[PDB]
Amino acid sequence: MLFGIGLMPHGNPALSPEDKETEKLAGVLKDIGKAFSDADSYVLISPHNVRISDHLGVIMAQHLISWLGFEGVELPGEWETDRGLAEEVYNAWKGAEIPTVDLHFASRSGRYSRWPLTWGELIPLQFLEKKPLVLLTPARRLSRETLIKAGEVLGEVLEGSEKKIALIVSADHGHAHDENGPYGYRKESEEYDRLIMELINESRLEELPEIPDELIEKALPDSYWQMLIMLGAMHRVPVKLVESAYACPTYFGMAGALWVRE
Amino acid sequence: MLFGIGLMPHGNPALSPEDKETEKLAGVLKDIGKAFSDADSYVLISPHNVRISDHLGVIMAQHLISWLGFEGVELPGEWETDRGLAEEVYNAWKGAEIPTVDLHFASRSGRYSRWPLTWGELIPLQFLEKKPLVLLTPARRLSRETLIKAGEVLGEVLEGSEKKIALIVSADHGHAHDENGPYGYRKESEEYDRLIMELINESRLEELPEIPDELIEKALPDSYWQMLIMLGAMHRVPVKLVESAYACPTYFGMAGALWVRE
Ligand SMILES: [Zn+2]
Ligand SMILES: [Zn+2]
Ligand SMILES: [Zn+2]
Ligand SMILES: [Zn+2]
Numbered sequence: 089m090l091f092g093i094g095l096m097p098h099g100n101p102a103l104s105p106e107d108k109e110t111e112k113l114a115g116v117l118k119d120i121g122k123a124f125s126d127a128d129s130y131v132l133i134s135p136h137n138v139r140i141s142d143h144l145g146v147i148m149a150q151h152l153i154s155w156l157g158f159e160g161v162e163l164p165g166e167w168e169t170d171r172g173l174a175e176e177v178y179n180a181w182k183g184a185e186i187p188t189v190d191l192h193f194a195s196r197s198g199r200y201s202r203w204p205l206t207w208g209e210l211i212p213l214q215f216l217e218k219k220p221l222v223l224l225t226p227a228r229r230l231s232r233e234t235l236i237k238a239g240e241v242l243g244e245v246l247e248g249s250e251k252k253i254a255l256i257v258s259a260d261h262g263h264a265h266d267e268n269g270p271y272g273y274r275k276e277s278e279e280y281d282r283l284i285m286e287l288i289n290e291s292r293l294e295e296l297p298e299i300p301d302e303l304i305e306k307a308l309p310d311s312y313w314q315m316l317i318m319l320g321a322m323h324r325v326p327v328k329l330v331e332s333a334y335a336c337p338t339y340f341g342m343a344g345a346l347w348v349r350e
Numbered sequence: 351m352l353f354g355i356g357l358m359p360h361g362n363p364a365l366s367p368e369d370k371e372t373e374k375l376a377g378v379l380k381d382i383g384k385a386f387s388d389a390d391s392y393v394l395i396s397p398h399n400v401r402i403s404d405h406l407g408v409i410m411a412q413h414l415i416s417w418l419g420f421e422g423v424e425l426p427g428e429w430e431t432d433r434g435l436a437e438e439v440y441n442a443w444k445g446a447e448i449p450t451v452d453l454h455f456a457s458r459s460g461r462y463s464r465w466p467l468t469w470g471e472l473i474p475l476q477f478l479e480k481k482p483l484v485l486l487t488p489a490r491r492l493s494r495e496t497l498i499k500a501g502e503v504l505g506e507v508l509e510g511s512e513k514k515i516a517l518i519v520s521a522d523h524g525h526a527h528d529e530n531g532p533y534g535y536r537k538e539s540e541e542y543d544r545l546i547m548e549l550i551n552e553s554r555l556e557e558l559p560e561i562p563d564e565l566i567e568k569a570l571p572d573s574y575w576q577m578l579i580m581l582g583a584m585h586r587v588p589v590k591l592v593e594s595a596y597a598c599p600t601y602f603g604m605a606g607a608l609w610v611r612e
C-alpha cells in the first residue's frame with residue numbers, strides 16, 4: 089500500500105537553514121518525516137548514487153552504509169535493504185521490459201553485503217524515522233515514456249504490497265542561479281524551478297513530460313528524471329498535495345512536497 | 351597492446367605468508383608486479399565488487415577509493431580510472447552485444463566521482479606499481495559462451511590500444527578446504543583447484559568451459575566466471591605461461607600465474 093510520496097531535496101542548507109525560505113522548506117521535510125513515521129518501508133529514488141546511462145538500478149545489498157557526504161558534511165549511519173520488496177520491484181520492471189539491473193556488492197549476504205550511501209540519500213534520510221529501504225536509481229538516457237512507465241510499474245508493486253510504503257524522491261532543481269556558483273548563472277534555472285513549483289502546487293504534474301530537453305539542458309537540474317518516475321507512480325495511486333515549499337539560498341533550487349492518499 | 355595477463359588471488363594470507371607454499375605464491379605475485387611495472391594501465395576483473403546477475407560492469411568513476419577490507423585487514427589507498435580506456439571497453443562490449451553497464455557514481459566527473467574498492471581489488475593491487483585502472487566485473491548468469499566472447503572483445507580493445515596494458519584477473523578458487531572454514535570441507539574444492547592448476551600448467555585453459563556446473567556448485571570457487579573472460583582474451587592475443595604457484599593455507603585455494611605475449 090503506497091500511503092504517501094515525499095519529494096525531498098539533497099542540499100546541505102536543508103539541514104542548516106540560514107533564511108526564512110529554507111526554514112519553511114525544513115518545516116515541510118519535518119512534516120514528511122512525521123507523516124511517514126508509521127510506514128513499514130521506504131522506497132528512495134536518488135540521482136547521486138550509482139548512475140547507469142540506460143538501466144534503472146535496484147540495490148540488493150543488505151546493508152546501506154553512509155559513505156559520501158557533500159562538501160565534507162558527514163551524516164553517519166546505516167540502513168537496511170528491504171530485500172523482498174527490492175526483488176519485487178526488480179522483477180516487475182524486468183517483466184515490463186524496463187531496463188534494470190540488480191546490484192549486489194562484495195558478498196550476497198552477511199556483513200560484507202553492503203552498499204555506499206551519499207548525500208543524495210543521506211540528506212532526505214535525516215528527516216525520516218529509520219525503516220528498511222529500497223534504493224532505486226534513475227537513468228538519464230531512458231525516454232520520458234520509459235521513465236513514466238517504470239513509475240507506473242513501481243506504483244503497482246508498492247500499492248499491491250501488504251506493507252505500508254512511502255516513496256521518497258530525492259531531487260534538487262536548477263543549479264545555475266548564481267554567477268558565483270559552480271555552474272555560474274543561467275536564466276533557465278529559475279524558469280525550470282518556477283515551472284516545477286507551479287506544476288506541483290497547482291496539481292498539474294501530468295505536464296512534466298512536456299518540458300523540452302532544451303530547458304533541461306540549460307537549467308541543469310537533477311530532478312527531472314526521477315520526477316517522471318514519481319509521476320508514473322501517481323498514475324496508479326491517487327494522491328493529494330498536503331503542502332510544499334521552495335528555497336534557493338545559494339545557487340540551486342530545492343523543494344519539499346508531501347502527497348498523501350486521496 | 352595487451353602486454354600480459356596476471357591471475358592473482360585476493361586472500362589476506364598472500365600479504366602475510368606463514369608457510370613455504372604461500373611464500374612461493376607471494377613470489378609469483380611480486381614477479382607479476384615486476385613484469386608489468388612498465389605498463390601504462392591495468393585492466394582489473396574482480397568478483398568482489400559490484401555484482402550484477404546478467405551484465406558486465408565497467409566502472410567509469412574517476413576516483414577508486416579503498417572501502418572494504420576483508421576480516422579487518424584494511425588496505426587504505428586511492429587509484430584512478432583510465433576513463434578513456436574504460437569507455438573503449440564499454441563501447442566495444444555494447445557494439446558486440448555483450449550485456450554491460452556503464453557505472454558512474456554521484457557525479458560524472460570531479461571530486462565526487464568516486465567508487466569503492468574491496469579486498470577483491472585491494473589485495474592484487476598491493477603487488478602492482480600504481481597505474482590508472484579499468485575495473486570490470488563478471489556476471490555469473492551469463493553463458494560460458496557470452497563470457498568467453500566478452501573476453502575476446504576485451505582482448506581486441508586492449509590489443510588495439512596505443513597503451514601498454516596488463517590484464518589482472520582477481521580470483522580465488524574452491525572455498526571448502528577446511529572443516530573449520532565457513533563452508534567446512536568438500537572434496538570438490540580440491541578437485542576443482544587441482545583441475546584449474548592442471549589446465550594452467552599444461553596450457554589447456556581451452557577446457558575451462560567444459561567444467562560441469564555440479565563441480566563448480568560444490569567446490570564454491572569465485573574464480574570461474576572471470577577466468578572464462580580471461581580465456582576469451584587469450585583467444586585473441588597469443589600468450590605463454592611464464593610461471594605459476596598454488597597455495598591453500600586456510601580454507602580456500604589461491605593461485606598466481608603470469609602469461610606474457612607468445
Ligand atoms: Zn543534486
Ligand atoms: Zn497558473
Ligand atoms: Zn541490459
Ligand atoms: Zn573471493
Ligand SMILES: [Zn+2]
Nearest residue numbers: 548549552554
Ligand atoms: Zn594432465
